[PDB]
Symmetry: C6
Subunit: 206 residues, 6 copies
């Protein structure tokens, strides 16, 4: 990473990333973990992290195709001894050296190729998280003997993995959460009506 | 975090927070653990920690609604090129502010401590979650007839933690001993007397 | 902690304290562990450590009442832009900010509120260690088939948890150790008489 | 390593490399792990890491023979008191050079990066080892009749990693779905279609 | 410890010492572990490490009595506002000295190294404990008739560690081989001969 | 160690050495582990590391006799307020203080007593690795149903533990490897003839 001087990847940062994917796969928390463990990363560090992912090579190829899509858009938007202009392949670290990546990231002003690449990767990880969610939000309904908290847990766990704006996800919640509570809770919830906080809803259905 | 220069979140700090929620859920010790592990945190760091919470998404939405309540109050109380702008509640929560803006606010002279402000909102929300997930009222904590007094007091204050009654809820044999001490006994004296 | 500048609690120091209490409860070694892990701690750090204690809330309330006792004694002894005088509640961190605690601890000369509070806590932990010792020293007697070393181990393990001066504890040893050895060892021990070292006693009864 | 001053190898860096070979042998992720854990390494550090590999001594001799091939090519391309001498291939590999000579080359103005050069030779050898120890050809990766498409693609690119065909090797039901998409489908579209 | 400025004891240094006593008790390797983990330690640090020893309180009282013996000898050999006072044995052991006094002695020009002095007393006591807890005399270590020579030598020097005889205590078949070598054989020659 | 100022042994370096010997004993990888974990070590650090070795006291006495041999050779070759000349016992740290060892190692120019001692120890460890190898190279022969890679693994594992020059070990390989392959592979190997790489041999016998 760049901390401005270049620094070696630490073994613990690398191991922390491998362990996250091993234990959580592509649960939504992989994205905050990747962003935090990739703080300051060069494109070379980013490629190291992705290359250490064990298995899940279908998702990694999907990630690659997302990167190629974003690099093509970068090239569309941005066609001796001096700083080169980075193309998409440079940002992805396929056609650029570490020395060039350091030069871009530490220049005044910088071309933050590490942050640009990280954005493309996170977009790819968002797609993977959506693709690998085992549930769809229309199928989350409160069981007749499921505590309301357990149902809300399942609801937002599913909604968390979908790829959409926060405002879009909130519309889905207003459309489905109370409506798919079980009969006894749904009537209590509708009696409270809109504007009830989730805290108030959970107290009323406990 | 900011320690003023910005530093990356530490991998151990990150893992420590995930592990605490994994192992203890929302027992009351999650609050001091969060406060200690979020020392110096930016709003981006704070959203990172909260986003790494596995499961418990009902609690996390409740936390989100507490943050929005506090952000709305911030906006009620606090409604140029190259100059520093005034943070809204959404800026403090990190939904409409960049990391550079957060660093700028947090390191300014004088600082707008958006990380500390957001952390206060989060801890208020965590307090609500700890209360919500406590399974028992203090009224229902009563010493069993064969329960050692120390175990009963352990359950009592563990329950109070998440929220004269100690004497009233003791079992008949110990209540008689405790009443004979007279009011004003220390807990150590009560525990010695009913040992 | 203060190391003079303030520094964040480290996750490992915090975890080390939680693990000590988890594994040892209120064995006497909790006190050296707490003192070492709380080196440089502010009252806020000290409250963080105590608040992370899992369970044992009876002891924690007893600790609280010891702190309130000491703070009341501090207040009895010690009734723009300048340094405030700390009351007992300030030292315990209930009515003081971290900024004020840093100010006291780094002042020239300092009001060492962290060390003062730590003293009150350790006094409280000493009480808890005494209260939670499962044995009393009068009940430690060498079995007819217990090796002398095992008996001495049990004797000093019990004496270690009692709350008393070192000179008082040494008086109890002179009163009880040889006297409560089993018949065969007690005669050998008395034959050596006083002034024998524990090394010499253990050789003579092995 | 050199970070320019020479530093001792870290015990965690050392253990991390031993553990990776212990747990994953020569799966393809050994290459990025070696490259990351050998950041800044001298040839002495690199020989230390390789000498700590437990077992797999056939692979290690193959690595040795790759290094000698590259060293011979270096000598083909690049054949005074107190002055700095020109490194041979054996000097870059650390068989005939001292640590002080390696430090001198690596820190000179301009530097002869013997650590980076040796690391390139080693990674070329590790690439050969990864290929040799892959048990399967991509031609033999075909979707089972009850195999979910995602599991098949997982095996496919895991196999390719160590080395239109994806469509041809899919099972009849999915191949029909994939052909109906027309050429040019993204992998995400193929995976959605055969989900 | 002092590294000169005073530093807090490290949590890992602390845990490393507790773990060593937990796992190996008072096998001889406890001595080098204590010496290494007490590098730079003040008398307060040294009392902290010793106070964290779990169990083994008979050994710890023996250690205490050794310290008092050495402290009495110190007082036999070495019997003003703002000035530095002369440390007694109790000051070196940390029973009558403050941390600031210990820091003052240890960092003075020239220093009174009370931490190193106390550490020598402690190691003398630990040596006594290692001897006391060794269960066997070297006279009772003899090679079994089916015991490989290497295992016997392992037991032999492990026993000597805690405290011609090697030849005399070997079994008849190996003793004959060793006598035929003649005196002056290295241990490697003896081990090769009786392999 | 010396990093030029003296520094305490780190607990993790020490634990890493103890764990290596615990898990690997005197497999050949003990030597690179010892050399890396002893980087910068004083003779006192080196004695600390060797003294923490659990068990294996026969090898440790053999190591001691190797050190005494090398120290005797050093003494043969190298018979107020100024720097003392180190004898072999000084280099081994038996008759020298840490202060003297620091003085030698940090002098201008240095007497690198830490590196000298480390050389003697590694020579001793080489002997121990050879002595404790459970196989001899003449006994490594490819089974009739052993994959060629498994046989080569066993061959070089055995050869790795022998104490000899690399050129000597390579002569043993040319003398024995193909010659002790099983009949079917040996004929394929001889058909390729000399100059075949091990990669080519392993492909031809797979
Ligand atoms: C080891 C080291 C020295 C290095 C490097 C290194 C250098 C560059 C690149 C790279 C980066 C971005 C793109 Cl977009 C492409 C590209 N896009 S392209 C031109 O259209 O094919 N190609 N490349 C290879 C390049 F540059 F060589 F051309 C890349 C990689 C990627 C990093 C990566 C890993 C990952 F998991 C997911 C990603 F999105 C990106 N790793 C690979 O690609 C390895 N891989 N191999 C194959 C296959 F076998 F099928 F072919 C497959 C992968 C895969 F990606 F995992 C995915 C399953 C398919 N690593 S290091 C620094 O890590 O120590
Ligand atoms: C990954 C990364 C790059 C980032 C970021 C990032 C950026 C901003 C915000 C955020 C912060 C504060 C508020 Cl108040 C809102 C808000 N309030 S609002 C406008 O009224 O909806 N919205 N946001 C999203 C924003 F900004 F996009 F709008 C936020 C988040 C939160 C952080 C957070 C996590 C948490 F657990 C509890 C919290 F209180 C806050 N995370 C999410 O919200 C994710 N999430 N998604 C849903 C879903 F919609 F599915 F139901 C749900 C959550 C949930 F919160 F967990 C809860 C279960 C419901 N993260 S990073 C820095 O972590 O690396
Ligand atoms: C989370 C965070 C932000 C903070 C803080 C924070 C701030 C202040 C204080 C505090 C400190 C000292 C005293 Cl004397 C009192 C006091 N004495 S009093 C006026 O006479 O009641 N009160 N306080 C609360 C105050 F200040 F709010 F008033 C305190 C605490 C204590 C710290 C503490 C924990 C502990 F284990 C043992 C201690 F001796 C002290 N924690 C609590 O008290 C929590 N607790 N709650 C209850 C109960 F539910 F029964 F009520 C019970 C406890 C308990 F102590 F554990 C014990 C079982 C009984 N923590 S942080 C920095 O940790 O991240
Ligand atoms: C311990 C320490 C102080 C050191 C050093 C040290 C110094 C130099 C070298 C070395 C480096 C490069 C080449 Cl190309 C040759 C070479 N090529 S050659 C002239 O044509 O034979 N020889 N050397 C030995 C040299 F220099 F002595 F000549 C080397 C090694 C290698 C490092 C290495 C390990 C590895 F796994 C794979 C590698 F590619 C390189 N280690 C060995 O070779 C050990 N080894 N032994 C044999 C045996 F002979 F038994 F079959 C075998 C190996 C083996 F390689 F593992 C492989 C299975 C065969 N280590 S340290 C710094 O680690 O602390
Ligand atoms: C907690 C903390 C704040 C502190 C401190 C603190 C301060 C001073 C001392 C101390 C040091 C040296 C000597 Cl010579 C004597 C002494 N010699 S004497 C006058 O002749 O009695 N006395 N002391 C106590 C003093 F100073 F108070 F007087 C000491 C101790 C010792 C440290 C120690 C532990 C150990 F294991 C072995 C040692 F050799 C020394 N610990 C104790 O003695 C505790 N202990 N208690 C008893 C009991 F009485 F129950 F039998 C027993 C012990 C025991 F030693 F373990 C042994 C089994 C017997 N610790 S901290 C810095 O650790 O955070
Ligand atoms: C604890 C501490 C403060 C210290 C120190 C300390 C100081 C010096 C020395 C030492 C160093 C080198 C030589 Cl050559 C001799 C020597 N050679 S000699 C004159 O011809 O006998 N003697 N010494 C002891 C000296 F100096 F005291 F004389 C040494 C040792 C050795 C270090 C060592 C350990 C090891 F494993 C292997 C080694 F090659 C060297 N440790 C011992 O020798 C302990 N030991 N004891 C016996 C026995 F019981 F049989 F006797 C046996 C050993 C043994 F070596 F393990 C081997 C099984 C036989 N340690 S510390 C810094 O570690 O914290």
């Amino acid at each position: 990473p760049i901390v401005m001087v270049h620094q070696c990847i630490s073994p613990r940062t690398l191991n922390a990333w491998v362990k996250v994917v091993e234990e959580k796969a592509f649960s939504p928390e992989v994205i905050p973990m990747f962003s935090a463990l990739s703080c300051g990363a060069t494109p070379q560090d980013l490629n190291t992290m992705l290359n250490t992912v064990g298995g899940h090579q279908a998702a990694m190829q999907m990630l690659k195709e997302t990167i190629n899509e974003e690099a093509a858009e970068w090239d569309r938007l941005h066609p001796p001894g001096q700083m080169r202009e980075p193309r998409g392949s440079d940002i992805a670290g396929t056609t650029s050296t570490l020395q060039e990546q350091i030069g871009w990231m530490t220049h005044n002003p910088p071309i933050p190729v590490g942050e640009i690449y990280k954005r493309w990767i996170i977009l790819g990880l968002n797609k993977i998280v959506r693709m690998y969610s085992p549930t769809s939000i229309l199928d989350i309904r409160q069981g007749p003997k499921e505590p309301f908290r357990d149902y809300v847990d399942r609801f937002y766990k599913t909604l968390r993995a979908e790829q959409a704006s926060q405002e879009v996800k909130n519309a889905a919640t207003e459309t489905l959460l109370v409506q798919n509570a079980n009969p006894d809770c749904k009537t209590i919830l509708k009696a409270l009506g809109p504007g009830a906080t989730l805290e108030e809803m959970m107290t009323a259905c406990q």
